[PDB]
Design a protein around this ligand. Structure first.
Ligand SMILES: O[C@@H]1[C@@H](O)[C@H](O[C@@H]2CO[C@@H](O)[C@H](O)[C@H]2O)OC[C@H]1O
Ligand SMILES: O[C@@H]1[C@@H](O)[C@H](O[C@@H]2CO[C@@H](O)[C@H](O)[C@H]2O)OC[C@H]1O
Ligand code: NA
Length: 330
């Protein structure tokens, strides 16, 4: 590493380089983070269930640890995430009888949560994924079904953004989602954000999760999505980048190690990805990987539980992979 290029420095004039972490991985991959990133995202500890597990009971300990680590190393922090159909406790949508609360009650709870969480980290966290994955990933419908939407109505997103803006008007507020480059979903996301923006809703950016594979999405699809979203006048952040060695249909579990072909194609894939990102440096301001080294990745258990994946730039021994060299040489 002594002579190894530093990711954040390599892209100093293009965009921040980040990593999703948790207190455990911060310790386990501490030096890698210190040497390469200038932005941090909580992989799970800033999600609803990990911040307010019970009404009125806030558990900021793990999140505080992540933020402290970031600030002590002059690293920016992205807040993930306020309103999502996943990892949100049941109490949020129920009353005493266990029945669903009303629209006004859920809005009160939403505002209180957003207000409390956002205010605590105001001045330390510069952006927030306010709404996460609201768009349907399948079907002809625009929106995915969720208790938030069901109880409040389709304007639940408008309210979420307004609440966050009030809590910290200096923060950049994002709509974050995956499969953001497949045409059908891209158009739904574009339509949604455009509609919010056309209503004066304070949404400042679109978060492209980029949970990609070696083949999907294509570079043309990525370029088209970047341009389509950028045309709305919003800032763009790649928020959870990883390049899986397995396509969606590939559910093998025997592979103890990636083939030379996989490693080679991944290197090419990452080089092409970053060449494209650099080309659009004017609209892309941050690129965060959902992790940093192959010794820790949510893809080891998703979508197939119990297997192993090698989706990042560094291997399990924290050594640069072929993908690292192509990525930093664009
Ligand atoms: O649960 C979500 C995953 O489904 C998502 O991964 C996508 C699954 O569908 C595939 O067709 C896509 O290629 C893949 O990106 O990642 C985000 C996670 O929250
Ligand atoms: O440890 C796991 C996390 O890595 C995972 O993070 C999700 C990745 O996919 C994105 O679509 C989501 O927004 C992001 O929260 O969540 C589950 C957790 O067990
Ligand atoms: Na930029």
């Amino acid at each position: 590493n002594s002579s190894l290029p530093s990711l954040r420095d390599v892209f100093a004039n293009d965009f921040r380089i980040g990593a999703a972490v948790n207190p455990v991985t911060i310790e386990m991959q501490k030096q890698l983070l210190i040497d390469h990133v200038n932005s941090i995202t909580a992989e799970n500890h800033m999600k609803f269930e990990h911040l307010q597990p019970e009404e009125g009971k806030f558990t900021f300990q793990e999140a505080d640890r992540i933020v402290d680590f970031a600030c002590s190393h002059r690293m920016a922090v992205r807040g993930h995430t306020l309103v999502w159909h996943n990892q949100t406790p049941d109490w949020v949508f129920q009353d005493g009888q266990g029945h669903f609360v009303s629209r006004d009650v859920l809005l009160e709870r939403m505002k209180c949560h957003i207000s409390t969480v956002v205010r605590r980290y105001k001045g330390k966290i510069y952006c927030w994924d306010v709404i996460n994955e609201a768009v349907a990933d399948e079907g002809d419908e625009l929106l995915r079904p969720s208790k938030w939407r069901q109880i409040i109505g389709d304007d639940f997103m408008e309210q979420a953004f307004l609440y966050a803006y009030e809590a910290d008007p200096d923060a950049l507020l994002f709509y974050n989602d995956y499969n953001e480059c497949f045409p059908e979903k891209r158009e739904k996301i574009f339509a949604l954000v455009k509609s919010l923006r056309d209503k004066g809703i304070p949404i400042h950016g679109i978060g492209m999760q980029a949970h990609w594979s070696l083949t999907r999405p294509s570079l043309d699809e990525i370029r088209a999505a970047i341009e389509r979203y950028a045309s709305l006048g919003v800032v763009l952040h790649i928020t959870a980048l990883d390049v899986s060695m397995f396509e969606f249909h590939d559910r093998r579990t025997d592979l103890a190690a990636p083939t030379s072909e996989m490693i080679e194609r991944q290197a090419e894939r990452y080089g092409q990805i970053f060449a494209l990102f650099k080309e659009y440096r004017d609209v892309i301001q941050s690129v965060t990987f959902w992790g940093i080294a192959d010794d820790h990745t949510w893809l080891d258990n998703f979508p197939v539980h119990g297997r192993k994946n090698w989706p990042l730039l560094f291997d399990e021994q924290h050594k640069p992979k072929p993908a690292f060299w192509r990525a930093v040489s664009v």
